[PDB]
Write a protein that binds this ligand. Structure first.
Ligand SMILES: C[C@H](CCC(=O)O)[C@H]1CC[C@H]2[C@@H]3[C@H](O)C[C@@H]4C[C@H](O)CC[C@]4(C)[C@H]3C[C@H](O)[C@]12C
Ligand SMILES: C[C@H](CCC(=O)O)[C@H]1CC[C@H]2[C@@H]3[C@H](O)C[C@@H]4C[C@H](O)CC[C@]4(C)[C@H]3C[C@H](O)[C@]12C
Ligand SMILES: C[C@H](CCC(=O)O)[C@H]1CC[C@H]2[C@@H]3[C@H](O)C[C@@H]4C[C@H](O)CC[C@]4(C)[C@H]3C[C@H](O)[C@]12C
Ligand SMILES: C[C@H](CCC(=O)O)[C@H]1CC[C@H]2[C@@H]3[C@H](O)C[C@@H]4C[C@H](O)CC[C@]4(C)[C@H]3C[C@H](O)[C@]12C
Ligand SMILES: C[C@H](CCC(=O)O)[C@H]1CC[C@H]2[C@@H]3[C@H](O)C[C@@H]4C[C@H](O)CC[C@]4(C)[C@H]3C[C@H](O)[C@]12C
Ligand SMILES: C[C@H](CCC(=O)O)[C@H]1CC[C@H]2[C@@H]3[C@H](O)C[C@@H]4C[C@H](O)CC[C@]4(C)[C@H]3C[C@H](O)[C@]12C
Ligand code: FES
Ligand code: FES
Lengths: 359, 359
């Protein structure tokens, strides 16, 4: 039986091997919906080349590459299995991976979906909280693909552009937090302080109206409510780079600050991504938990396991797609409102691309 | 007959008459928990004096004074009426107003509570979302009062230091939003965009770990979920002053940005305060809705009514106090975690003041 419904799982992606690092960075630095550089066509390949060594080294430190594709595939397989049972009327379902900067690229996925002659296509962002820089960028790629190929889609499109508080997503986070709290010495469990950590954004992006911070904040509240506020927490942000102002507090500075103030039992909780990747395996685990934490004299610092292959997470994914199909939703109401200070003309085109879809 | 349980309603307060502006500002610039200034004892009176004219003018523009005490009193009376019926075991209940910078001052309220021979005293912040600059400052005042008076309290203390997602608070906001949406022309109701607006914070405060942004964001999500995402929204921030970086987007820039982008039907929703005051009556209503909006060519801009005298809000207050009493809570779990980068030694003292209370 030929595939009827395709679920395009969108994510930035990460290099699978050290050899993929260079092109990963190149594609990224060439992206306008994310970055404007002078003589970009020249500096893009240059900056990619100069950062490759350091980035390859980071991936070497975690085993030689990014596990994003492996986890995405496992989740997609689980999701599809459930969807075929949940929604027989839209089966067979097939998942496609559309990474923004690595293979399979968004464009390659769309080309295959079209080639497979699907009746329906769902742009399912793998980022629970919407940022014009993450989900937005992936959605722009879809609009741009058809605009560039100079032809209309042969499939009916729609998008699940955000899902910051999906009940099953929240349950997964809560479950992983609880099981990690169990790993702390019993005598320190109640003393543990939780630092929810999400990739930060430059203040210039936050100030334009990016939906991200508020949604990430919503996820945190939902998780803590489910945990019945068993431990105190703080939502902090990681991955800042460069000298420019970014949304803080910074995860690293917070870890150090807590230790200096007597809170030496910390539980890190990646709250804005669903699989392991450089942010968790390198930045949180090595950079902060092994090096920084040791230098600050932490007693116990752990990190909640990433959702990865948790069966309940695959259930969450299937539930989202199923509910989306049943509601005939073309996109969230939120997507119909671009940032108040958006200056990228493509955002409105992308929005319209989805709001105007037939069906 | 004699009062048994006192509910101290904490809020910054506002000058009741133009004549009260000067001392309001003086007390404020003399608060080390709010800000630290060089030679503060000399600069406070000086700054208060220089700002008085402009601030008096703002209050003149809204009628001649702040309605905060009037609304606070009405809510307090309604709250007490309900509490006497809800919690007979802790009745008679008495509410006391503890304004940070205007009469009745926090210190004056405490003196009266002590004098009334209360058995229980509850520091009930009127800010649903915790900021060390709002609720924290108020709680610090309580600790400082006893530390300064050189005497221990004669009543049992506890605090309701935050309540960002209390179901009745959320219902009130949603109700007021729905009725304001009904005031827009029917043909534009669906086109209306919601701007949740809350007093901004300097990035220096946000970056040290202030709980505020994340909690305000939680309130927004709960309200939108209750409204079933009927309209698109954005959480923006108002009241920024000075040349330093503050958390954006700015409410004023967002209003202008939306209009320039074709979204000329806006609903402003104060989401971090429960009564009318300078932020709503002047900043939003006059500064932004009457002047700015007009200059931007807005079609319709309205503001959800503040909670003020809504009976359901008095119920929310009573329910919070009731649940607090029945739970025997001394404070939220959140108060037990000071900011990761807190540099104010009084914060820990204040925290301990409550966590260490007998009972
Ligand atoms: C100016 C521009 C940022 C523009 C902006 O966002 O306003 C920045 C982004 C990355 C920068 C480049 C990268 O840092 C790589 C190089 C760093 C060297 O120190 C200067 C040249 C160098 C090639 C930089 C030139 C310039 O300062 C760039 C291109
Ligand atoms: C800052 C920007 C998001 C901006 C926005 O909020 O719109 C994010 C998106 C992808 C990020 C980049 C990618 O993760 C790839 C690189 C990862 C390195 O660890 C830092 C540089 C690096 C080049 C990152 C810089 C920055 O954090 C980027 C560019
Ligand atoms: C750190 C890295 C340059 C590394 C190098 O010179 O080797 C530079 C290259 C392009 C930069 C990014 C681009 O200038 C686009 C964004 C500009 C904002 O002011 C900060 C975030 C922002 C996302 C920058 C983050 C960071 O400074 C980047 C990623
Ligand atoms: C330097 C200090 C801020 C210190 C800090 O945050 O680290 C700021 C806070 C308020 C400022 C003062 C207030 O703005 C009032 C005055 C404004 C005048 O333009 C300069 C003198 C003036 C008296 C300022 C001096 C100085 O710049 C102050 C005292
Ligand atoms: C910025 C600060 C909160 C700081 C923090 O996040 O810790 C808030 C608390 C009370 C505010 C002040 C009070 O509202 C009184 C004044 C109101 C005027 O409209 C601006 C100046 C004014 C003097 C305000 C400046 C600033 O917005 C203050 C000082
Ligand atoms: C604007 C006002 C001075 C007005 C005047 O003298 O004309 C100054 C006096 C003290 C200032 C505040 C204090 O310096 C404390 C805070 C310092 C932060 O860098 C900005 C917020 C912050 C809360 C300042 C806001 C604003 O710039 C204030 C309130
Ligand atoms: S930058 Fe957010 S919609 Fe364009
Ligand atoms: S400044 Fe937040 S706890 Fe001290």
């Amino acid at each position: 039986r030929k595939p009827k419904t395709g679920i395009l799982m969108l994510n930035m992606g990460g290099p699978e091997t050290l050899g993929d690092v260079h092109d990963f960075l190149l594609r990224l630095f060439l992206d306008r919906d994310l970055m404007t550089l002078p003589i970009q066509n020249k500096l893009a390949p240059f900056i990619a080349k100069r950062l490759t060594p350091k980035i390859q080294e980071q991936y070497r430190r975690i085993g030689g590459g990014s596990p994003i594709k492996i986890w995405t595939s496992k989740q997609g397989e689980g999701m599809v299995k459930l969807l075929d049972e949940l929604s027989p009327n839209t089966a067979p379902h097939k998942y496609y991976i559309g990474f923004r900067y690595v293979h399979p690229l968004t464009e390659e996925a769309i080309e295959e979906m079209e080639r497979d002659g699907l009746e329906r296509a769902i742009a399912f962002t793998q980022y629970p909280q919407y940022s014009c820089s993450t989900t937005g960028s992936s959605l722009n790629a879809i609009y741009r693909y058809y605009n560039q190929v100079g032809r209309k889609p042969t499939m009916k499109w729609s998008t699940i552009d955000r899902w910051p508080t999906h009940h099953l997503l929240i349950q997964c986070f809560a479950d992983h937090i609880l099981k990690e709290l169990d790993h702390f010495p019993l005598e320190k469990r109640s003393e543990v302080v939780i630092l929810f950590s999400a990739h930060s954004l430059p203040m210039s992006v936050v100030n334009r109206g990016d939906p991200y911070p508020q949604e990430v904040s919503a996820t945190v509240q939902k998780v803590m409510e489910r945990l019945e506020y068993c431990n105190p927490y703080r939502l902090v942000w990681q991955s800042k780079v460069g000298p420019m102002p970014w949304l803080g507090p910074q995860t690293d500075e917070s870890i150090k600050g807590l230790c200096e103030r007597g809170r030496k039992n910390i539980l890190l909780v990646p709250i804005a991504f669903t699989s392991d990747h450089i942010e968790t395996l390198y930045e949180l685990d090595i950079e902060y938990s092994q090096v920084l934490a040791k230098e600050c004299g932490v007693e116990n610092i752990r990190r909640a396991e990433s959702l990865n292959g948790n069966p309940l997470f695959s259930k969450a994914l299937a539930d989202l797609v199923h509910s989306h199909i049943q509601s005939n939703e073309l996109c969230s109401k939120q997507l119909t409102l671009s940032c108040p200070l958006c200056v990228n003309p493509v955002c409105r085109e992308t929005k319209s691309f989805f709001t105007s879809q037939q069906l």
